[PDB]
Paper text:
Omega transaminases (ω-TAs) can mediate the chiral amination of several unnatural substrates without the requirement of an α-COOH group and are highly relevant in the production of several pharmaceutical intermediates of commercial interest. In this work, we successfully overexpressed and characterized the two recombinant transaminases TA_2799 and TA_5182 from [name] [name] and solved their crystal structures. There are two highly flexible loops present in the structures of TA_2799 and TA_5182 that mediate the entry and exit of the cofactor and the substrate/byproduct into the active site of the enzyme, leading to significant conformational changes in the enzyme structure.
The crystal structure of [name] mutant of TA_2799 was solved at a resolution of 2.5 Å. The TA_2799_[name] mutant was crystallized in its apo form, with a sulfate ion bound in the phosphate-binding pocket of the enzyme. We expected PLP electron density in the crystal structure of the TA_2799_[name] mutant; however, only sulfate ion density could be seen. PLP may have been present at the active site, but not covalently bound as an internal aldimine, and thus, the sulfate ions from the crystallization mother liquor could compete and displace the PLP molecule out of the active site pocket. In the crystal structure of the TA_2799_[name] mutant enzyme, the ND1 of the N121 residue maintains hydrogen bonds with both OE1 and OE2 of E123, which provides further stability to the anion-pi stacking interaction between E123 and F322 in the same monomer. The mutant enzyme’s affinity towards the cofactor PLP is clearly enhanced as observed by the yellow coloration of the enzyme solution post-purification and the characteristic peak for PLP at 420 nm seen in the absorbance spectra of the purified enzyme, similar to the report of Kwon et al.. The TA_2799_[name] mutant showed the best increase in stability; it retained ∼70% of its activity even after 96h of storage.
Author numbering:
A (entry chain A): 4 to 459
B (entry chain B): 6 to 458
Write the structure that this text describes.
Amino acid sequence: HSSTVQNDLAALIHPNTNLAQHREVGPLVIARGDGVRVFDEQGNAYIEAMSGLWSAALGFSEQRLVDAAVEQFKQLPYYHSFSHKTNAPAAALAAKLAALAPGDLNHVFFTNSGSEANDSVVKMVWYVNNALGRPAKKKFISRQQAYHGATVAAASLTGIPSMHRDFDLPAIPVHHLTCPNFYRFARPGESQEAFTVRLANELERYILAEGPETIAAFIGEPVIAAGGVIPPPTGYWAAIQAVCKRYDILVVIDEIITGFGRLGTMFGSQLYGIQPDIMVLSKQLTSSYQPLAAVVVSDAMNDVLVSQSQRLGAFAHGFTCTGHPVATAVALENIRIIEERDLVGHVQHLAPVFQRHLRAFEDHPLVGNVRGVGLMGGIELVADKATRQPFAQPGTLGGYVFKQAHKHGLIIRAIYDTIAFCPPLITTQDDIEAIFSAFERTLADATDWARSQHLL
Amino acid sequence: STVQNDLAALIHPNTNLAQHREVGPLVIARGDGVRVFDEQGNAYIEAMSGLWSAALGFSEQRLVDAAVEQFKQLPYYHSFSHKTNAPAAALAAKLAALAPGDLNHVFFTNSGSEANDSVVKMVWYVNNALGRPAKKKFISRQQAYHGATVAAASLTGIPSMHRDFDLPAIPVHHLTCPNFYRFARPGESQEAFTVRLANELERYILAEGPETIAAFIGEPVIAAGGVIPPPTGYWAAIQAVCKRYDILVVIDEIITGFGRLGTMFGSQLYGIQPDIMVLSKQLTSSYQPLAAVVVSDAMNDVLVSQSQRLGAFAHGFTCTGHPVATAVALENIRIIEERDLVGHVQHLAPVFQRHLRAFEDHPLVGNVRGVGLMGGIELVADKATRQPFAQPGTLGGYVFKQAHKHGLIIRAIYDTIAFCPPLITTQDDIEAIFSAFERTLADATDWARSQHL
């Protein structure tokens, strides 16, 4: 027990942690960062194959981000954006994001987190529809296994059952479509194109049952990340958009994870041909070196927001650190770096090698499914490959892989019994070989451990 | 280029977005102690510390140094799945020690809004765990401010924050605003007002059913709703009622925290023992986005017992416990303690309050109120009848704009002028503030005649 461990154990409530287990096993203290690696307090190295929380695009020791922070700290360490006040980095970053975003996504509202951002979206949509004299048009459509944040509103949009348990969620009008997961929900011999068609029919039937005039918006990640790295089936996004367009339902695309090159395009929306009305960004926006998120909205949306100020006085919504000069300065440098080094290009060239390494595990006895796009992938472990069936208590094996991978210098994320990989954009071919080498040893240990636990 | 960029692409918080297209932004470029400078080089005394937040002013190098030091070690890591970092852990322990009572467990967020949102979820979670599914309603107050997320803004009780947002969206009741000047009956004492306010709460609980009411939330002093200190005895009475019906007491110190009222926490000044305390703003002087929820041992025990059967506390933000933001909070608090800035406020408060009170007999001023280094000057149309103006906020709106021409940034809360200067404010700064305000108020007296009110 070091000073940090004693302090942690006394006083710190951990997010997304088994708080009871935590009292027994205690924390793992991370002390230092170096490229795609982080080091614990004892000096052990770990390849961070998840970029932290899908977030650390430029790795854990990019000096240029520190420099951008330092530069801005010396000018103006803090000011707000209320009552017409602004600062240069926020304004520049707004314009940058307006330019990068497809279509007429040209207006930016800043928050600290993805959660706050999605919460802001819910409020904006309600506000807009009230302004347009459509009081009934307020319901959001999401999907099972979606993740959209942790505030009451955002977590309501979230569709992972464990994130709702005992939190009285959803607490706002939300309907969750089935998870677009071909491996799990496709019928025998059904094509992806046919699955897409059923998924789109599911959406349309729901709209018609509820009444289109009651449905304001659809929200979705291009690829479902925290829900188990589930890429969409072929044609999914074109079908979903066509239905939304037919019934005047806003399309809200959550690129909190997919944004800034993760899928081999700057935004996942480009890869899947999505034209959002609203796009939400965070994480790789700053490599999480600073808390920042952005809501980008259409000119149409913005026009309604503005027309509301005409009759209501002010847009009565904001956070203290909305537009923080340091956080936005860091985002600007982060984006400069991604463009200048063509890291989107790098991902396109690295993706096939990353995916090939993933696919290598298809024929493993424990592996039921492998899936991935760009530089994000998942390996789902199952009890029986024939019946694609999960384990007695899902997450037992994944939980073990998560712990055991540490002993081989690897940090991954277990989503129940799916192992997730989302390495930094600066990952090299050599880093990939190191990751999967370490994972192969972990999976060997797991194969042993699973037999002695009589799980298979 | 900043203005063109702003006008093209930036949706401003808490701004008239239509007016913004016409007048455009004011670009703030540089900071120096209690001053900020625009792009054109004009100086302004920031008598609001930004948003009640910049405790150590706008150019404290030690905070930058703490940030830089931490950036070079570990610029980012998360606190999920048992992971931790040294600053987060140290800050948790520090806050656990500073907080009164058995407030010993800390959960970190980026904002006050997220923090209060977390509180709502924690309370619901705990009551579900303890087999009380109906016990979920929050009690707040008119003019309260608790944040801008759907849930937090629902707790907020400023009507303009709800307009056209379909809020509240969760079970909440708003008590009358504890504002003696405004809502006392003729010749009523503060002690009597408090008694009615406490009775109001109790009778509401009994009418709704105590088994449906989970928690009370309140700022010790209502800040954003118009710098409204509680009436005498208020907090003792409110606590007694809450205790009687097993209603959690949640104290929002997002603004009052870290010396603002002349004690480290406002809870100490007013003898409040919270079950839950919420902190932000002055926690980092807003140099980094950070907030903290501090909870009792009892609360925490239930959170822990839930992990035993659910497998996880299924709540978190990416930047929960951010090593840089927490590092900065630690240094910020170290600085407040080392310089005894709580002590500084105690010695400066009487001078600050005296300067405020000087305006009591001004023709435009109906009421002056304040505690510690927070104050408000409420402008009215008639001092006799304590009556507001035709459209509230017209005069205050003018004072806000006009003060800029005299190098002063304040905040207009409708027609109440708010003052919340940095903890590092000096006696000289105070004289400069009120000097500039006196000129502003003179301009306002002229402007009010020509507008016929």
